[PDB]
Ligand SMILES: Nc1ncnc2c1ncn2[C@@H]1O[C@H](COP(=O)(O)OP(=O)(O)OP(O)(O)=S)[C@@H](O)[C@H]1O
């Protein structure tokens with residue numbers, strides 16, 4: 082029994098491939114192989130073209146009050162600041178725009194084959 | 206990006222995660238998609254750690270402990286990192302060039318995957 | 327070497343902190359009425375009985391304590407085994423052992 | 432007719448008339464070995480010529496009035512024919528009190544003021560209340576403010592609304608100028624030379640050389656060096672009171688690295704004590720006090736208060752007291768509070784030109800108001816209702 | 828630059844996590860308050876009183892270089908700041924960053 086080889090290198094070498102997120106683009110918009118076994122032809126072709134969110138719907142839902150509580154089953158301003166509120170509403174608008182853009186980006190790609198095709202073609 | 210001052214998952218399962226990030230220019234409270242809680246637990250993120258979270262992907266990187274806690278023990282095997290200087294929320298518009306070969310090799314093999322076949326791959 | 331229990335270290339720390347509130351270190355050059363503790367005990371001041379003197383005391387800091395050398399003040403990686411005092415170098419350890427370790431000279 | 436404004440601090444008494452200027456006079460008696468039978472009172476310390484080995488007789492212990500005889504003597508000297516010639520029967524007095532003043536001390540104050548001197552009317556307030564009044568007079572648009580009173584014996588942090596004090600959120604830090612001076616004495620005595628009998632000189636040294644560091648560990652690294660690169664290290668010549676009346680710092684061009692000087696000047700070399708002593712205000716745990724520092728305490732006091740009022744409190748941080756005169760104090764406080772404050776809330780820290788006399792100016796301003804007569808408690812009302820109504824009217 | 832702690836172990840205490848470690852040189856002795864990661868590192872590599880070990884503070888890399896009561900105990904300061912210089916070939920950088928655990932290919936071919 083021998084001790085292992087301790088190979089020592091510069092700490093900067095281990096960060097050679099590392100790129101800060103603010104310096105690189107999202108490669109998930111080109112991820113085709115990641116959709117296999119997870120995304121179906123139904124989702125890409127029939128559902129999403131019909132049930133994509135719109136900015137108008139998102140804004141309406143965000144601005145509207147909370148929905149009424151679900152019924153139980155039955156067996157049958159001195160301290161107000163204008164600048165702070167303007168900042169907060171600008172932040173809310175930015176958040177809603179980000180939500181819309183991310184929801185559009187994360188369902189843009191359609192699978193090459195899809196779950197249905199693979200399941201049909203996969204014999205026991 | 207910033208030091209974690211609070212990490213509270215909100216139960217309805219977890220409806221959302223409320224996180225508190227601190228920088229030299231202030232503190233911000235963020236509501237996280239519940240899928241990021243798994244990434245935070247995998248990265249072993251606790252209060253006092255300096256992390257960054259990607260808004261578009263939810264990726265979490267724990268880049269060490271804050272140097273304000275460097276004296277909490279006399280001998281720990283920890284990497285202590287300065288507190289970030291700018292704002293918690295950082296926006297940058299970038300132009301990056303990629304080639305078709307990069308997308309080809311990116312789609313030649315799968316990435317990640319918690320299945321046994323993916324891990325063995 | 328000898329080792330000092332927690333009570334001795336706490337007493338030393340309390341004595342050092344109390345010495346910082348002393349009016350003078352010497353005696354009266356002429357050489358020939360209450361105190362704060364008497365006032366507190368006469369006030370019969372109870373915790374959680376509204377805002378008062380005791381409840382106004384600052385709580386423990388969130389940031390951990392930073393060690394400094396008891397001899398020169400620069401940061402100190404080392405802790406003296408005998409008394410728990412912090413120190414940063416062999417010279418500082420020798421000075422601390424000669425001066426204020428064990429017996430308080 | 433006239434109104435007397437007094438800030439009975441544990442270190443300096445800010446005494447003056449409402450129609451006149453302000454005077455800063457030490458509120459303690461002195462004894463020295465150069466005088467066999469002679470006790471100096473208040474500003475008489477200027478008469479002595481060898482303040483080395485000076486003995487202090489204080490009327491305040493831990494920031495509260497505990498010795499009544501010396502305080503009575505100091506007041507009699509200040510109110511006597513030599514200083515101000517106060518006509519007690521036709522004068523109103525505004526005198527400040529420590530926060531959370533004990534019931535016994537308040538009763539003694541009322542009894543002494545209304546019987547031994549027989550003032551026409553007395554208004555007992557806190558220095559923070561006067562500072563808040565002055566700040567609101569200066570800034571009419573602000574509805575809330577937070578006052579940091581870093582004084583001789585303590586440092587309170589008190590938030591004030593327009594006409595009310597938030598008693599719930601008052602936080603006291605047991606670090607003051609007395610503690611800093613004693614710590615500097617102890618450090619110098621342990622390291623270079625014994626100065627434990629030189630409280631006056633060490634206090635002047637602290638006032639002259641100490642400063643608040645923006646980067647603590649960078650300054651520590653700079654101080655640890657030897658040679659030209661050690662810009663922090665300076666040489667101080669202590670006053671011998673024979674040919675050097677007052678202490679001074681040697682110019683950097685005149686500094687000698689070896690430390691030996693042909694002139695027989697007693698030179699005190701301070702390198703890391705310049706910012707280690709002031710750092711106790713921001714980090715009490717450095718010396719062993721398990722208490723939060725000034726910025727963390729400010730943030731805690733604000734965050735205890737309701738959410739709607741928090742941005743207003745964050746916008747009106749005011750620094751008062753002697754310890755606030757350290758170089759870099761305001762910048763350090765602002766930086767730390769900005770680091771701790773939520774990013775959506777703006778942070779503004781204001782250091783007045785004379786933080787010592789802020790409370791006195793506030794008292795003068797509140798004296799000039801047309802609502803002054805309603806605030807005070809008269810002696811005629813004192814005879815029957817006084818002892819209860821003094822507690823009722825005064826928001827101590 | 829790295830901080831290297833080299834000394835002789837005097838006493839190691841671990842309690843259910845908190846722990847203490849006492850190290851000595853020929854000129855000074857010290858007790859350390861240990862963190863969780865260093866406690867785990869010292870538990871994984873069996874360290875007992877009398878062993879002469881060196882610790883890399885940032886990584887917890889503990890290597891036992893003998894026992895003293897055989898290597899003489901270190902003389903000077905326990906904690907030393909050292910400047911470490913590495914000359915790394917471009918091939919080494921490429922192989923290390925080619926894949927996870929890719930440095931093994933520097934030793935077993937398989938690049
Ligand atoms: N230029 C200065 N630099 C540093 N400290 C100073 C300076 N001028 C005064 N001080 C300190 O200020 C303190 C006195 O400040 P004050 O707030 O006036 O004390 P005080 O208010 O009379 O007593 P309290 O705390 O209100 S009971 C002393 O400890 C002095 O050392």
Ligand SMILES: [Mg+2]
Pocket residue numbers: 438440441558582
């Ligand atoms: Mg005062």
Ligand SMILES: [Zn+2]
Pocket residue numbers: 395396397398399400413414415418
């Ligand atoms: Zn030292």
Ligand SMILES: [Zn+2]
Pocket residue numbers: 406407408409410411422423426427428
């Ligand atoms: Zn010791």
